Every structure is written in structure tokens, then in C-alpha cells.
């Protein structure tokens, strides 16, 4: 085989793949395989993209015999992959041992599960085969704890929230405010995060050059909540969520969910586009309600 890997911590893989459940339930999923590991890149309507980073140290039998190309790309379905990694590996005495396999172009993506009592082989046929913010024009940068952001996202989901807004304004007195203004059936809904360092660990607002820390001006982000709710399940296991947005209307979410002692967690990168916001008077009401 051109690639082979075996793992025993199937719960981590299950949660990592379930982070993609908020996206398309039954669509395609594209997989890179290289020496560093394997990644799952998923895009929806060219407006939002998620990406996993399952490191090599997470697996204990990562081989990657491929030499013709630096990476191997395969496109398969995601739902049956989730059901395959949904073993839950119960009965701690006899741990289920997965075995991912791929033998280059034309071969199925095999997922062998061994229990020493039950043998299951799942093969998936592969199919025929962007949203990145520039690291120079960042408008604001925030580091929020995962629990608070997940609670805010869940509350926004529970109130409808057809549209959502992002507020990021720094002040000269070292006071930072971060709120999520929402359009819904209720009207104007806001969820402002605390200014303490336990939750809002860092909040820096720039002048579109990522260097000058400017104060007194607010960064506005108009995002469709259908794309915003895609990150809700990712933040559930996140320990610290890193928020970044440039002036080009691209929001990048860095999920840092810090089992093997060497692998550095699972890296989830979510990139999201910003709504055009043709109505110029909406932001006026946003800042008017923010000032009060």
C-alpha cells in the first residue's frame, strides 16, 4: 500500500470528523495524505471552508510509502466515513484497532477495524478531483475561550438569528469589548463577552496592516448565521478559539483543542466569507446600539 496507518484512539477521530457534521451532511470530502499526516478539507458553496490536521504522531503505524508525489489527494463521501469511525470502541479490554489504507490512484480507501473477535472491512471508492485570509491586512485579532463562544453560538442558534454581526473595538484605557449582534425574529440581540483575561484573553484591533494597534475604532463583520453555525460544534471541544478577520471580509477561526503524548491536538481551521451588506444604514444602528 502507498499509505497505511493504525490507531487505537477512535474517540478523537470520531469527534474530529463530527466537527464536519455541521457542514454538508452527505457530500464529498477531500483528503490530503503526506508525511506530516492527513487532512480533511471541506467547502460549502465557495463561501466557507473547514480543514482538519490529524498529525502523524496521533497514529502509531503511519508509513506513507508514496514517493512519486509529495501528497496524495482523494475525494470520497463523508457520511459513511463518519459511520465507519463511529465504532465508539467500547469494552476497554479489547480495544478496536483501526487501519487506514490507500494504494494510490484507482484503489479504494479501506478502513479495517479489528476487535480480535469481530473483523470489519469498509472500502470507499474515490471520485475525480481559495478561502484564505492574507497575513498582512488583518483588521482585528481575538482569542476567546471555547466554552464562552460555544455558549454564545448556542444562544444565537436558539433565538433564530437569521443574520449575525461581529463587534471588535479597542480603547486607550486597555478596555476591550467583543459582542455578537444578531438579526432575528426578536429584533436586535447582542451577546457581549467579558473583558476579563479568563475569556477574552487577547483582543487587538489594527488599521488594516496587522501592525499598528489602533484604539477607539470598531471593526464590523456581517456574516450569514448559516455559515456561523458551522463553527458551533468545532468550538464545543475547543480549549481556546482564535479569531481573525482582514479588511477583505474573510473570517478565520483557529480551533486549538490541546491519547499520544507527542501529537499537538487537532488543528481545525475554519474560513468564512463576509456578507456584502448593501444597506449602509444597518451598521449605523449597530454602532448606535453599541455606544449605549
Amino acid at each position: 500500500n502507498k499509505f497505511s496507518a493504525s490507531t487505537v484512539h477512535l474517540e478523537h477521530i470520531t469527534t474530529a470528523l463530527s466537527c464536519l457534521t455541521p457542514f454538508g451532511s452527505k457530500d464529498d470530502v477531500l483528503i490530503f495524505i503526506d508525511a506530516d499526516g492527513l487532512s480533511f478539507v471541506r467547502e460549502n458553496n465557495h463561501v466557507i471552508k473547514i480543514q482538519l490536521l490529524l498529525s502523524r504522531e496521533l497514529f502509531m503505524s503511519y508509513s506513507y510509502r508514496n514517493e512519486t508525489e509529495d501528497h496524495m489527494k482523494l475525494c470520497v463521501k463523508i457520511n459513511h466515513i463518519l459511520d465507519s469511525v463511529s465504532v465508539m470502541n467500547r469494552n476497554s479490554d479489547d480495544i478496536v484497532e483501526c487501519t487506514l489504507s490507500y494504494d494510490g490512484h484507482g484503489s479504494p480507501f479501506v478502513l479495517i477495524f479489528e476487535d480480535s473477535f469481530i473483523s470489519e472491512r469498509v472500502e470507499y471508492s474515490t471520485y475525480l478531483i481559495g478561502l484564505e485570509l492574507d497575513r498582512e491586512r488583518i483588521s482585528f485579532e481575538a482569542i476567546i475561550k471555547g466554552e464562552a463562544l460555544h455558549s454564545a453560538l448556542k444562544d444565537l442558534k436558539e433565538i433564530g438569528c437569521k443574520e449575525c454581526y461581529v463587534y471588535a473595538k479597542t480603547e486607550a484605557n486597555d478596555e476591550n469589548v467583543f459582542a455578537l449582534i444578531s438579526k432575528s425574529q426578536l429584533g436586535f440581540s447582542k451577546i457581549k463577552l467579558p473583558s476579563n483575561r479568563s475569556i477574552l484573553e487577547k483582543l487587538q484591533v489594527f488599521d488594516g496592516d496587522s501592525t499598528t494597534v489602533i484604539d477607539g475604532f470598531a471593526v464590523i463583520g456581517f456574516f450569514d448565521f448559516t455559515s456561523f453555525d458551522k463553527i458551533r460544534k468545532s468550538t464545543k471541544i475547543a480549549s481556546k478559539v482564535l479569531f481573525r478577520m482582514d479588511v477583505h471580509g474573510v473570517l478565520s477561526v483557529n480551533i486549538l483543542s490541546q491519547l499520544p503524548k507527542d501529537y499537538p491536538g487537532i488543528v481545525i481551521e475554519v474560513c468564512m466569507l463576509e456578507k456584502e451588506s448593501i444597506d449602509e444604514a444597518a451598521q449605523t444602528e449597530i454602532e448606535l446600539l453599541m455606544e449605549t
Binding site: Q185, D279, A281, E285
Partner: protein, 319 residues
């Protein structure tokens, strides 16, 4: 870089004074705007003659600053199911927004002809419940698609096709604003091709300016084509079969027009053909229907159209 609004939206009127065409209807809309007591209304007519922009301008001049949270514009692009109508329309109608003594909230329902019947009944209930605070404006192409109980509470305003003079006036305003070279023959050709459609006239003018510059008959007729209903009408009204066959070939077959399009256009023209007898009209309708059946079943060659023309001429000159 590519940043230039198309002339259709770059020159969209923002006030009721810039809308040409139905002078009486625009005057009535101005009177409503200056009075404030706007009733429930239904606006119908041909596409691109100033229905949506008239309603938007009326709402803008009727609410002004309160337009942001005093109107609710729902269209076919947005979901308009019975649940959506129920929730959103009931919440917007119940909202107690302070307004001038003669001012009311406006619920603009564009493309009302494509709304489900249950949503129409929910709209009936909402109108009967909250008629004293909000008013409903309907924009549609035909008023028959709106159910009779909804039309009972609405004042129907019908928009006629734009005349050549009003189209010429608006076009000349656009030339004077953009300062492009033009020829009177070219403007006449643009009006002739537009066929009473203002948006089509603007699109054709913009294409002519952006592709050739000076707007004459030659450039316009080299970028845009003459309306095929008129060509089909000329083909059907030919005296002898040879001329009709030559027109059909050299104007629809060499130009790249599908046979099914020709048959449908012939049916429409025969439906709206004057100076012909009823028996002749129904015989040509029957022949066009037989040809349509033959085209639909798979035989879509030029021979079928030639035979249709031959039978039409045979019935025209009798036997």
C-alpha cells in the same frame, strides 16, 4: 479591476418624478405620497415598465427616515411560505412604530404572482386583522395570479406598455448624463428593438456604447437583432409561398433560431393576428398545433416548418 454599475441599476430612478410612462398613474402615486393615506394596491403590467421602482420610490417618499424599519420587502428570491408569512408578517404588522398622522407601514410583496395559495389566505387574515396600521403593496406581472379575496381589498393599478416618446425621453436623459455620441436613427432603432421595454432599451444602449461607441442604426442592428415575433408575423402574412419560405430560411434558420421557438412564436402571432378571417385563423392555429406536435415528438427539421408554411398558404389562397 472591474467596478462599474450597469446603466440599468446605475440610473434606477430614486424619485417618482424620474419615472416615465403611465403619467396618470405616476401622478396618482405622487398624490398618495403627498397625502400619506396609501391603500392596499396591486400593480400589474409588462416586465421592465416601472412597477418595482415605482413602489420603492413611493415607499421612500412616504416614509423617508423610517424606511429602514417601516417597510418589509419580500420577493420570490426570499422564502414566502405560509409559516414565513405567518411569523414575519404578523410580527411586522403587530409592531407599534410611531409615524406621522397620515403615515402607515408598507409591506412590499414583489413577484406576488409566484406565492402559494395558503400564503394568500394568511395574507387575507393579516389584512383583515391589521389593516389600520400597515398596508400591503403587490407587484406582479398579471393580476389573475392573485386570488380574488386579496384583490377585493386592493386598489388595482394597471401599468400600460411604455410609449416611444417616454422611452425616447428617458434614453435622451441617459445620453445627456453619460455624454455618449448618438444618432437619431440609432435611437429609433433602439426604441424599435426594445418593444416598449425600458430595461431592454437601457441594456441595448449600454451594449452598443460599450461595443461600438457611436450609436447608429448600423451598429445597433449589428449587435442586437430585430424582434423575432415581427419576423414571424411578416413570414405568416406573405402573399406567395416562395417569399415566406425565403424569409423563414434566411431569417430564422440561418440566424440560429430553434424550430420550437419558431412554432411557439407563430402560435402567439396567430393568436394576436389582425386583418384575418376567423376560419382562416383557426385553420392556421390547427396547422401550427400539428406542426408543434410533430416538433415535440422529435421531427424538428426545416421540412416540417416548410410544410407548415405550405399548408398555411394553401388554406390562405383556398382550393
Amino acid at each position: 479591476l472591474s467596478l462599474q454599475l450597469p446603466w440599468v441599476e446605475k440610473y434606477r430612478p430614486q424619485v417618482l418624478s424620474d419615472i416615465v410612462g403611465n403619467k396618470e398613474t405616476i401622478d396618482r402615486l405622487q398624490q398618495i405620497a403627498k397625502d400619506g393615506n396609501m391603500p392596499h394596491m396591486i400593480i400589474s403590467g409588462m416586465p421592465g415598465i416601472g412597477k418595482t421602482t415605482s413602489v420603492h420610490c413611493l415607499a421612500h417618499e412616504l416614509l423617508g427616515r423610517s424606511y429602514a424599519d417601516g417597510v418589509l420587502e419580500l420577493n420570490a428570491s426570499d422564502d414566502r411560505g405560509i409559516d414565513v408569512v405567518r411569523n414575519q408578517i404578523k410580527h411586522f404588522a403587530q409592531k407599534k412604530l410611531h409615524l406621522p398622522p397620515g403615515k402607515h407601514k408598507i409591506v412590499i410583496l414583489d413577484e406576488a404572482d409566484s406565492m402559494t395559495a395558503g400564503a394568500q389566505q394568511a395574507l387575507r387574515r393579516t389584512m383583515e386583522l391589521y389593516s389600520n396600521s400597515t398596508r400591503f403593496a403587490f407587484a406582479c406581472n398579471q393580476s389573475n395570479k392573485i386570488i380574488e379575496p386579496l384583490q377585493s381589498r386592493c386598489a388595482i393599478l394597471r401599468y400600460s406598455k411604455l410609449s416611444d416618446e417616454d422611452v425616447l425621453k428617458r434614453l435622451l436623459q441617459i445620453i445627456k448624463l453619460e455624454d455618449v455620441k448618438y444618432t437619431n436613427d440609432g435611437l429609433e432603432a433602439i426604441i424599435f428593438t426594445a418593444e416598449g421595454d425600458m430595461r431592454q432599451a437601457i441594456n441595448n444602449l449600454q451594449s452598443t456604447v460599450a461595443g461600438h461607441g457611436l450609436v447608429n442604426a448600423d451598429n445597433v442592428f449589428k449587435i442586437v437583432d430585430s424582434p423575432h415575433p415581427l419576423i414571424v408575423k411578416k413570414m405568416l402574412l406573405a402573399s406567395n409561398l416562395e417569399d415566406s419560405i425565403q424569409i423563414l430560411r434566411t431569417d430564422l434558420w440561418k440566424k440560429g433560431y430553434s424550430s420550437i421557438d419558431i412554432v411557439t412564436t407563430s402560435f402567439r402571432v396567430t393568436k394576436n393576428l389582425a386583418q384575418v378571417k376567423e376560419s382562416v385563423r383557426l385553420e392556421m392555429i390547427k396547422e401550427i398545433g400539428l406542426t408543434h406536435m410533430r416538433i415535440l415528438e422529435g421531427v424538428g427539421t426545416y421540412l416540417q416548418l416548410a410544410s407548415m408554411l405550405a399548408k398555411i398558404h394553401k388554406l390562405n389562397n383556398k382550393a
